[PDB]
Amino acid sequence: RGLNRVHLQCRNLQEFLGGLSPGVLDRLYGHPATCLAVFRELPSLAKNWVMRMLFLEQPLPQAAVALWVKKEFSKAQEESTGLLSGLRIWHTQLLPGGLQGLILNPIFRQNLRIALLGGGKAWSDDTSQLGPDKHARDVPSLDKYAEERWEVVLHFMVGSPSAAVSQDLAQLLSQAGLMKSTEPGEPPCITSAGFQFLLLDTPAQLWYFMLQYLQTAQSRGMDLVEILSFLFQLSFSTLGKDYSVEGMSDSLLNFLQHLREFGLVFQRKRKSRRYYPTRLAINLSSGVSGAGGTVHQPGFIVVETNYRLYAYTESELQIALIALFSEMLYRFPNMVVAQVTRESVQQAIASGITAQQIIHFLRTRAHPVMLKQTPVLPPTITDQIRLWELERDRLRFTEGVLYNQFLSQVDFELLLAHARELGVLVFENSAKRLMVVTPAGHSDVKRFWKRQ
Amino acid sequence: XXXXXXXXXXXXXXXXXXXXXXXXXXXXXXXXXXXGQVRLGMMRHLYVVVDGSRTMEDQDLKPNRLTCTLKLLEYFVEEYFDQNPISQIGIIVTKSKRAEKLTELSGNPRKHITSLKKAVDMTCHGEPSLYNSLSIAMQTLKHMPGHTSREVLIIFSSLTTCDPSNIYDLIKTLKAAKIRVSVIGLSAEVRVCTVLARETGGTYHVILDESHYKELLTHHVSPPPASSSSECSLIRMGFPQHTIXXXXXXXXXXXXXXXXXXXXXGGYFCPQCRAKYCELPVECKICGLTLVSAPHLARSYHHLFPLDAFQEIPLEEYNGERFCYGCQGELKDQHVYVCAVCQNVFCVDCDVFVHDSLHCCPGCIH
Amino acid sequence: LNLLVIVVDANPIWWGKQALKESQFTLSKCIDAVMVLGNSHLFMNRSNKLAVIASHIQESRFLYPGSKDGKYELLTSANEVIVEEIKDLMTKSDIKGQHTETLLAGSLAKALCYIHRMNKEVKDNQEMKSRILVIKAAEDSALQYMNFMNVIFAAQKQNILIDACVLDSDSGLLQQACDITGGLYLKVPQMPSLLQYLLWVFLPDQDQRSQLILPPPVHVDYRAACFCHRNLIEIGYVCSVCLSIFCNFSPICTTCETAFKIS
């Protein structure tokens, strides 16, 4: 903790896909699920530009792309162009003079056109013929199955006596940095990343599972490309119509039964030929479930100006979460009454939670009577929460290297200028020659001192 | 002191639900709308006289009566200029036994709503004066042309109607000057306003609620029918086309405006005097012509070939057309509404939408 | 959350003359450009909604409302129902002679009340913006002008934008509608490129009209004639009973048989 604390940063599919290898990307767009899934992530400018340039075989010059936009919006324009360029959609070509032509990656473009129009592949859908299936599953029972399995995983993180995790998933939770095993006679603890993982949205939690699951996909003979194509194949599916398995490798079978352990997919049998993509699997998307209401579950916490939480939900999980960032007084078979004490939040940040998790948690589960307010939370309470976290987080730490008490002043700004030159300047002085450089990048300037 | 005994229970599980449903159903009501195939007064110099009395400060409404009255007049100016474009409004606050022409007779909502946002901040001191307010409204409404149904709307609260002269000779004059005065009253019925309303030709009403008062002002939005007295003339009209800066201002006519203005390059001319107006419709400031874009005649054509009634039937009743002919949806409630001519099927949402906004049956167009 | 309501002027007489013309561009590419615009609109965001109406000569029947060939699945089901609905509509058809010019007021009326009910469907967190595309290819009848203005003013009140792609001929009432409501008007100069016009001009929503530089607004003619001789008027005589435009001054008002007071 001589570094900074573990701030749980969602990648939002840009820092994930921007930062890979372009051969991995050119294989990744080889299924239309991935092309639609990268398409909908785009900002609306880049969205409309791809849908503009889609039906086209000529590299348009740079002048037309810069000349399609009104003058006031150039600050919010270069982000869309740069995001198309870095994500290997727009590969740059040349008109035969000096006009740098721009053209969509024909793998990406061809598979988007397969996603919109007729195609040569078949989305890996198959059925030999099996009609009304032996133990066909019902849609609210798929909802129930999703709730049961993913709340079992959440109770496992919380540490209930409902610990039905089958110890590959527990090893996954230990490997992703969430449940640290210490002193190996089996206490599984919770890391502060686990507490910040709990207060997050359900699609954000599942997508963080998939990102930190594929972060260590070099382990079990897994490849990123086929797994991400299967994820984007799941989240573009329908609860009603039923699928088959024939057309999948054996490592896909191991991933799909591990995914059954996640609860995102309802099988019937392990040796079966059918899977039901669950309601958790459809809403798998890098985004935000809302600020007043969730498609998954309607909100249930009434936050009054008395710093008073009225939770209309019976669940030991969500009672434990409201125990995390508050303190609880009454429990009725319909309702829990809790009070947000200063000391409760200062306990919730001692274990490590930046209180944007808390405010977004309460905005996610906002009860439908708490709605029809344009500030859905009372801003006295919200600004008080932010003032409490700013009292707790008042130290900012940085490892540095000192320059003090120089013999001159020309070498002072010379060392400062060489620090600014190689981008290793941290903190400077004006009067008493007290400089802070990066300590890992200090040996460059130190060997420069042995050279002058 | 024992209203708590209003909640009965028979099975107590859905019986409290039945008591709550009876209360929530008794807390609502429907409007009463009238149809007519009669002549209407469509050019309409209406002139609003508000109290500024002592009784405007009484708190019978949820804010004091000045604030609620002024809010619904803001809504009134909005809906009246939204529905009748040719017409005009003028606002008099009547205050301290004297009458004050607060906003002159014009035809754009910006000045009137700006003046009402100003007039929130007033004082409301003294007793009103119906004599002087009807005198100022008469003085402006003498010389509007005879086909205009010249109308005054007095939103009147107090009871002591402190005039400085005799107000039956005004009612005889205003009877002879073919004006029409309608009074919306607060808290009471006053005999003089009743004689004024029944003799000039208008209609008198007293206020229960917010909702009833909205219903009364909505009743006075629509053009009221004409007597056997008002002139049926033929006003000469002008239809100026829009003119942009002709061909990149190749020999244009750079003007300022005609009523803090910038340099106008182009816009609307006049076919009588050839002046320069920014906005249309505007009465010609230097000619006396009235200038009309002519959807502004089409904005008020629904009064002339009006709607009809929907045959309202709640029960199931022979319905072999399960879906709404309005918007292709099922009829999940027990209210089915069937037109007169085509006799198609409509639901409640299509009922409110057709009868309030679209103003035509979608079937009868086909 | 957005709501595109495409309206395709399926005049069977006009597209029949277009298909006997033996051109490149027939009704099949028209309805296919409609469906590619629809799948593009559903494709741009998850929350978007689509509804496609087809004005026939005597009826406003809606067109709208696993993956065998590789599309997204709901796009496949929507394309299947639009294809089967136009095949049920146009093939099984009728013939009449007194009413053979197409209509646009009724389909716009259905679109207005459909947007009304789908705005009642919207919950309190989200808010719906809406527009009506009109793909017109025939000649509009004059006889429904009394009706037609009304639906425009409904779209003036309900804040629904109106856009129009006219294919063959200009239309004064429809460029009038796209001037009043704040929408957009476009006369295509070459038929088979229709989709590429739609995917740049008429695909972008309300918060991209202000960002994109678009083809400029044509000047709108506020021509006005009498009900007497149908000729163009710069100064007219309008009654205050009938509210009707007369060109020359006349004693007895014909439109409402008014006993005109003469001064």
Ligand SMILES: [Zn+2]
């Ligand atoms: Zn003039």
Ligand SMILES: [Zn+2]
């Ligand atoms: Zn009808």
Ligand SMILES: [Zn+2]
């Ligand atoms: Zn309906």
Ligand SMILES: [Zn+2]
């Ligand atoms: Zn007349």
